[PDB]
Curated annotation (Swiss-Prot), chains A, B:
Interacts with TAMALIN. The chain holds residues 30 to 508 of 879 of the full protein. It comes from Homo sapiens. Disulfide bonds join 28-70, 310-315, 354-361. One of its GO terms (biological process) is cellular response to stress. One of its GO terms (cellular component) is plasma membrane. This is Metabotropic glutamate receptor 3. G-protein coupled receptor for glutamate. Ligand binding causes a conformation change that triggers signaling via guanine nucleotide-binding proteins (G proteins) and modulates the activity of down-stream effectors. Signaling inhibits adenylate cyclase activity. The keyword Cell cycle does not apply. It is found in: Cell membrane.
Amino acid sequence: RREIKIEGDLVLGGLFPINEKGTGTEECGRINEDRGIQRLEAMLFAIDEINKDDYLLPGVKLGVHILDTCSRDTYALEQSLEFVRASLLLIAGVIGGSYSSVSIQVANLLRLFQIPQISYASTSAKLSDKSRYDYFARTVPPDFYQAKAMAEILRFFNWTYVSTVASEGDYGETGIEAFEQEARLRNISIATAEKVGRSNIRKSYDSVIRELLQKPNARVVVLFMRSDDSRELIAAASRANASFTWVASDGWGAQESIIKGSEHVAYGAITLELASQPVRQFDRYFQSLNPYNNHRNPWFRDFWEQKFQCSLRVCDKHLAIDSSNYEQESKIMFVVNAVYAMAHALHKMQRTLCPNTTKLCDAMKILDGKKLYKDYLLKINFTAPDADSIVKFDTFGDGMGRYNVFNFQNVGGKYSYLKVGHWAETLSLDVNSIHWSRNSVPTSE
Amino acid sequence: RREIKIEGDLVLGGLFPINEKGTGTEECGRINEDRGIQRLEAMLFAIDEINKDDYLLPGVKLGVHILDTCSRDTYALEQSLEFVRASLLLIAGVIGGSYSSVSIQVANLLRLFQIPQISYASTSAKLSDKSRYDYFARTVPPDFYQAKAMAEILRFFNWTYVSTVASEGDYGETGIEAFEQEARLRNISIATAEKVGRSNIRKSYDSVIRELLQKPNARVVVLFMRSDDSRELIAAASRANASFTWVASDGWGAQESIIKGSEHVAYGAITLELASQPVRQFDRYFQSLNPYNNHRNPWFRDFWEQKFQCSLRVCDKHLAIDSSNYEQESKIMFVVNAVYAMAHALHKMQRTLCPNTTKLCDAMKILDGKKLYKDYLLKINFTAPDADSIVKFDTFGDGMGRYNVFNFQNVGGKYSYLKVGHWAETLSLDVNSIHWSRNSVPTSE
Ligand SMILES: N[C@@]1(C(=O)O)CC[C@H]2[C@H](C(=O)O)[C@H]21
Ligand SMILES: N[C@@]1(C(=O)O)CC[C@H]2[C@H](C(=O)O)[C@H]21
């Protein structure tokens, strides 16, 4: 029964895809290093920082209850029952999840116990429906904007006949449906519309690649897809020696885990990811972690063994997370900001209900989740450790539509994602910086 | 009757392709800006510098007699008769020409009057035959080395099945014949061997392109070709939408005049040019020239009118040669070094025959061209305005086999030749710096 239980005056729930979905039958698979472990650690880091902050909840120690979702909504629901068992360890708010289907499933349960929820990565436009997700907010924007951003990229390059591939579920389907409307407003025609996934209703990854090849004019393929699904499509494209210009949503983003080993078939890909700035203090914190000093994370040993491909053959005692094997996951800023958003809402309620103490007074011992959400959580602060670096929610509990545009390249022997553009109400690109095809040495034999 | 006659104690002849060959019938065509005018000016500059040098011929003023070859050996012979009329204005030595056929034709005449000749650009291995060209030397190497350098480039990239195109004449034919032997030593097979040129025996440029397309496996085409011929082949390749990886000799080199307007069909070309270092003092001298202060050059007005596409519509009085419209022609170092080689040989003869004067004594009034060539011209000095920056000739009157390797690219909107390698006995390359194909935005319509 793996979890992180750290005692406090107020406890925050945490949900992270520590492990991937398991193959065939198994619930849990490999460790998700950057979107699982780093994010988990970014929450532990933010809590440690808040617990050292003299201006944010002094006298009110924040504890945690962090669980694995195994990248499955069904597994997340089971785990989320632990957060509500105390109403059937009391929970003040929940941080997570990542996948929109997980956040949706969790929200369906949490709203029944008036528990506020803040996601740091779920971008489904569905989650903006406050009549259904009345206790949900997020430091990230809805995919209404990402879809617009992608249609504007195609319109800019006159990619007027494209194919679409979407992951089944809450993220992919509504994301691509929004993209199809934006594309239609820009006289962009859709050649074929495919859906991928693990369910009984989905066609094969090879059948999807065959559908893309049956429209040879559509060389640009727009993807709104999970990471796990992006890998299976790339593998299928490889098997059929299919060549496409992939234009992918944040599900792919600037993740090297999707392209590693199949760099040639994803060359020249254009990807989006939410506009973020790395938390420098997090880099320091994360690089100091090892299996000998990190006692509070029960998944850290499995993470270490996977990351360094050894057993603790044998793991060298001086293996270290550093700039040679690590880069801050693009959405860490949102994790820290979500924990801080919850803490700021709690601090404000604390100062309103207990003005003559720093402590959790009698008037605030029984938390009013409804008031915490509506009267406090929709607040305003400058990010923790330009001009618009403020943490706030709109009327619908959403973040701002800001994205960075990336191009998958080969710099000088090394494959990476280079930032080539930005989207915030309008599209800005550095067209000269983009590489569209692999620079292969010609053959003459 | 266009020429440059500057009076001196000793006069040096000069031959430069000021104008291109004329089309159809006409002897002279457009002005050759960089290989014609700049080179001519590099000789006038070197003479001005020598005439200011207290350590090199003080007391012996160097004059000039500079003529246009119109890039034709037949025209060069006519002009060269002026240098020998004084034996049928006395000439001490001749600087030039550029094209190997011109230098050969000139040498056939000069050797009859014991007049030493130094070429700054003729690389034919034929000119190394001292039983035939007994008065010829050069600051440049024979193409025995360039051919080796090119075969080593192909061998390095495993380009084992290639086509060849050569300009008819002394440069192309012996250059490619040497390449074919070096390629055969490296198990490189030749698909087709074509020859181009203005003569009655040559097949069409379109017929040559058709021969290259009939061997589709041979994507790499090696060229030993004149500049004028390189342009006609590129135009023919364009008309047939032919795509090839061109590997070209110094005839093409790093000249933008060959690719201007047809950058797309020559993209990713690998070219060689003799290893040279720009003469900084020349840049200053050349950029100061305008049609109002340059009285001694009778072709400068035509040059200016062509370079700026105006009539002196109307040429702006403040038009200037600068870093925005000018780059020192790759072989300027060799022009300056050839003039200096002649001056050093004359200085040494002067100090041997007139030890008690700086002046041209009675003992040196009738120059012994045979002794000047054999006993003095094969000398040794550090270049004028690493460790091996010395000016010398081997036993055969030749320079050292050193080449720079260039790649025709699009940097960031601008098309240019980037140095990507070097050859001096062995091949060294920076493979990561090379671009092989045009980075075109994909089409999806
Ligand atoms: N924006 C996503 C979503 O399901 O809403 C797409 C896939 C997964 C991304 C993540 O964890 O960074 C989250
Ligand atoms: N090396 C050449 C030659 O005919 O020997 C080839 C074409 C022409 C080059 C030049 O003027 O720079 C000279």
